Design a protein around this ligand. Structure first.
Ligand SMILES: [Mg+2]
Ligand SMILES: [Mn+2]
Length: 541
């Protein structure tokens, strides 16, 4: 093992880290360990382990205070540090988060972009990160982000693959599955919700919020649409209804109105997830708190603000003397935030830059992760100079598509469309006129083929016929048309490829990311377990 780490250290010392500018390994002090005042409490993890998910739901309903879910381990560093937060920095504070904050409903540490990014860039297994965090944080609930029928991948998978991933993730320590569909289509979420319920975990059915419910000019995503969606989601037997504000679009008055109306229609607890990109995340959470929201999604203050979640400490102080208080130990939270600031100093090459409240997100409606990725893609193609026109094309392409919900992977479709549209300098009338001649991006064609599901109100018919010139268009779940996957054959082929008998997690990771898992295995052969390295040594040597 020593030769592998020596090889990796020599490689990084000489050739530098791939994708970042080469710099010297500047000296870092040891990150500040917290000084916690421990109080023993029965957490929602204990309730789930003892009496199951329904007891957890009843505990949430009987909690007068508003519960907090920490998104520091997944979404805060997905938005701010390009999902590059390593397990080595997480494990120095995992026990402190488990002990100093037992009032947390759950910690979101998995799903989203973490699964792909860990394998692709951090060269560490997300399953290994899950196992180490589960050992380190035994009395907290683990929340993951689940993309409906795509799970952690960006495309549709057959139903047995999704069920097996849910089973393996539940066995390895995931306690809450937040299941969302990119276009808010129920059939893509039904089977995942049923599988999560069968595995005994909490199923968070999710509504992606877009538009403005208080704006009569945009009537498609009105309050009645969300009420009907919440009713049919409650019909599926999900434990907690989740409201995912992917781009910070939910305004405070709209937040109060939406949470009140959803509280009237369903008896499910409501989980609200929003981003502070508009700068109104704190007041939105407060307005939802007055409306009666149950759980809200917060990050530590050092990894909060901008495209990330609002800070949990500021959410505590904003609700300190109101009718409803947040459930947190604020002193322990600040003590943990000191460590988070010190380890955020490690990830300087992955920082986005100077951040300000960005109220332009109300028009272009672009999520922050997709915002950073779109900026990087425009820089890679040399279009980063005209990113204001990129924003305008993004908004106009979204309106051209029929005002779709823009969350991954549907936001990636709109981003690719806008990049291609500015790439060869045409308008939407030019799309309707010349569109038979050009070759549209593959993601747009796949979306108009129905591989992402069915959008609300259906596709624009003439534009769809332009986009797919001769390809077949399905109108049902893409999982029905998926190729059958047999796990014994895949396991045998993986054993041939990686040279040893793989576990269920390795098989289900090979199915979702075939090339990425094999590249990760090759990197493990060449360099060993680089997750054990500290972050400045991992980046610079
Ligand atoms: Mg409650
Ligand atoms: Mn998010």
């Amino acid at each position: 093992r020593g030769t592998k780490t020596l090889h990796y250290l020599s490689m990084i010392t000489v050739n530098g880290f791939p994708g970042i500018e080469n710099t010297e390994k500047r000296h870092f002090e040891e990150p500040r360990q917290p000084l916690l005042n421990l109080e023993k409490k029965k957490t929602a993890k204990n309730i789930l382990d003892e009496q199951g998910a329904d007891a957890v739901v009843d505990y949430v309903k009987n909690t007068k205070e508003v519960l907090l879910t920490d998104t520091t381990l997944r979404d805060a560093h997905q938005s701010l540090l390009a999902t590059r937060l390593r397990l080595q920095d997480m494990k120095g504070i995992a026990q402190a988060i488990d002990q100093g904050l037992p009032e947390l409903f759950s910690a979101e540490m998995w799903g989203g972009a973490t699964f792909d990014v860990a394998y692709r860039f951090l060269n560490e297994s997300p399953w290994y990160r899950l196992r180490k965090l589960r050992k380190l944080m035994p009395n907290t609930m683990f929340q993951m982000l689940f993309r409906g029928s795509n799970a952690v991948g960006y495309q549709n998978y057959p139903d047995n693959v999704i069920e097996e991933f849910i089973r393996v993730a539940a066995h390895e320590g995931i306690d809450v599955f937040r299941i969302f569909d990119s276009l808010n289509w129920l059939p893509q979420m039904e089977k995942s919700i049923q599988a999560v319920r069968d595995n005994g975990k909490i199923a968070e059915a999710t509504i992606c919020y877009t538009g403005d419910i208080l704006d009569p000019s945009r009537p498609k995503y009105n309050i009645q649409y969300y009420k009907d969606l919440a009713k049919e989601l409650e019909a599926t037997g999900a434990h907690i209804l989740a409201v995912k504000d992917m781009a910070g679009l939910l305004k405070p008055q709209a937040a109060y109105r939406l949470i009140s109306e959803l509280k009237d229609t369903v008896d499910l607890p409501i989980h609200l997830h929003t981003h502070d990109t508009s700068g109104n995340g704190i007041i939105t959470y407060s307005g939802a708190t007055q409306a009666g929201v149950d759980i809200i999604d917060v990050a530590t203050a050092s990894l909060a603000g901008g495209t990330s979640q609002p800070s949990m400490q500021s959410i505590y102080y904003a609700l300190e003397h109101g009718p409803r208080h947040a459930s947190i130990n604020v002193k322990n939270a600040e003590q943990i935030d000191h460590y988070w600031e010190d380890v955020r100093k490690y990830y300087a090459p992955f920082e986005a830059g100077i951040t300000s409240p960005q109220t332009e997100v109300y028009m272009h409606e672009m999520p922050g992760g997709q915002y950073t990725n779109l900026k990087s893609q425009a820089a890679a193609v040399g279009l980063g100079h005209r990113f204001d026109e990129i924003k305008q094309m993004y908004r106009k392409v979204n309106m051209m598509f029929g005002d779709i919900i823009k969350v991954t992977p549907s936001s990636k479709v709109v981003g690719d469309m806008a990049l291609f549209m500015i790439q060869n300098d045409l308008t939407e009338e030019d799309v309707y006129a010349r569109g038979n001649e050009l070759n549209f991006p593959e993601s747009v064609v796949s979306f108009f083929r129905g591989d992402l599901g069915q959008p609300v109100g259906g596709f624009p018919e003439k534009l769809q016929k332009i986009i797919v010139k001769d390809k077949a268009v399905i109108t049902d779940r893409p999982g029905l048309h998926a190729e059958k996957v047999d796990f014994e054959t895949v396991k045998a082929d993986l054993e041939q490829k990686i040279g040893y008998e793989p576990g269920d997690h390795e098989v289900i990771s090979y199915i979702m990311y075939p090339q990425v898992f094999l590249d990760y295995q090759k990197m493990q052969r060449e360099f060993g377990a680089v997750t054990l390295l500290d972050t400045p040594t991992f980046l610079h040597g």
